[PDB]
Design a protein around this ligand. Structure first.
Ligand SMILES: Nc1ncnc2c1ncn2[C@@H]1O[C@H](COP(=O)(O)CP(=O)(O)OC[C@H]2O[C@@H](O)[C@H](O)[C@H]2O)[C@@H](O)[C@H]1O
Ligand SMILES: Nc1ncnc2c1ncn2[C@@H]1O[C@H](COP(=O)(O)CP(=O)(O)OC[C@H]2O[C@@H](O)[C@H](O)[C@H]2O)[C@@H](O)[C@H]1O
Ligand SMILES: [Mg+2]
Ligand SMILES: [Mg+2]
Ligand SMILES: [Mg+2]
Ligand SMILES: [Mg+2]
Ligand SMILES: [Mg+2]
Ligand SMILES: [Mg+2]
Lengths: 182, 182
């Protein structure tokens, strides 16, 4: 029961990102061209907290912004993979870490005006580094460790620029306080 | 001092959204094709709160997701427009409302892996409807009014799916409590 009717869907690019340009007939009966990254597609974001109340984060180059951003480890959910499995896999690839319990947090659409992608945040407990990272060609980042108090001070000061990381931290906060880690 | 060198930048689309495919030489010295929405580009998001402690929100169709989402009014910052002016303009266009003070909240990148866009959140005080909305062709939404207690209950329950709206609410919360509106 979509309010907009498909006239024609054109694929603008298939790789490395799929992008479409769709001609639709809108609620006004007129035509409009809408450009977007089609679904279904998802990514998992994971805040890895150690038993010492610290977080394992990454400082990662994000080319579209030209900046290195402080982020929680994250990555695309592969075909047939569950969000939790992608979270654990990306945590191992980007930080070389494993964790015990993963508490799922509220999923969200980072930019629904342009992409169908759903981001799945998780709070990983008893995180620990166990192996060297295995980064993809295209991934330029370094992992670091910060006390949770410092990470949340950065959040309060408005210094966390990556939206997904900021939101994951806000959703994780009550759990961290409940568990006695913050 | 970018870690990646431009080999060639190709424009994939110019309108309604500008998209590029850039061939770069990475930190490994190898080539990679990176697809993204180039900057500089920005949008403003504004949580409009009334003197009665209610919020003026929108339920808007977001085609890439196929869903109607509960969001704060928001829109692109036009050429030569300041983020605050875009916030006031979009608030008037989408909800037919005006406000007094606008408190700027921490800016953020909704999806730095794909777009350079910076989102600028604001908390607008003494919001009030004064005129009919003036929606663009392509904008399918309705405005509504909800008590702040209900909006924040939805946030806590993980029911706010739009990331930018969720983050704006989290950043606005301390200000609302300070001002006595929550
Ligand atoms: N826009 C792009 N264009 C070309 N190549 C790209 C792009 N985005 C990511 N890559 C490649 O993603 C890799 C392994 O990535 P994730 O660790 O899986 C990816 P993560 O990068 O942390 O991102 C999460 C998300 O933001 C959204 O754009 C995505 O849906 C998403 O997965 C890198 O080596 C990048 O070069
Ligand atoms: N991907 C798209 N493809 C084709 N047409 C589009 C697209 N996105 C928005 N529009 C048009 O934006 C209008 C006026 O929009 P905003 O009220 O200005 C826009 P807002 O829609 O609320 O969005 C804020 C943001 O999310 C990010 O994608 C943007 O940078 C951004 O501005 C609508 O009528 C849409 O059809
Ligand atoms: Mg990643
Ligand atoms: Mg990956
Ligand atoms: Mg990765
Ligand atoms: Mg809008
Ligand atoms: Mg606009
Ligand atoms: Mg608008």
């Amino acid at each position: 029961m979509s309010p907009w009717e498909r006239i024609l869907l054109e694929e603008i690019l298939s790789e490395p990102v799929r992008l479409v340009k769709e001609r639709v007939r809108t609620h006004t009966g007129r035509e409009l061209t809408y450009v977007y990254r089609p679904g279904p597609v998802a990514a998992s974001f994971v805040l890895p907290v150690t038993e010492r109340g610290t977080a394992l984060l990454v400082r990662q180059y994000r080319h579209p912004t030209g900046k290195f951003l402080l982020e929680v480890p994250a990555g695309k959910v592969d075909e047939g993979e569950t969000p939790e499995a992608a979270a654990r896999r990306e945590l191992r690839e980007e930080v070389g870490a494993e964790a015990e319990t993963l508490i799922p947090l509220p999923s969200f659409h980072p930019q629904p005006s342009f992409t169908a992608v759903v981001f799945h945040p998780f709070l990983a407990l008893k995180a620990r580094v166990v192996t060297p990272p295995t980064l993809e060609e295209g991934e330029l980042l370094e992992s670091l460790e910060l006390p949770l108090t410092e990470v949340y001070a950065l959040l309060a000061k408005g210094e966390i620029q990556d939206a997904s990381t900021a939101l994951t931290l806000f959703y994780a906060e009550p759990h961290l306080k409940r568990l006695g880690l913050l």
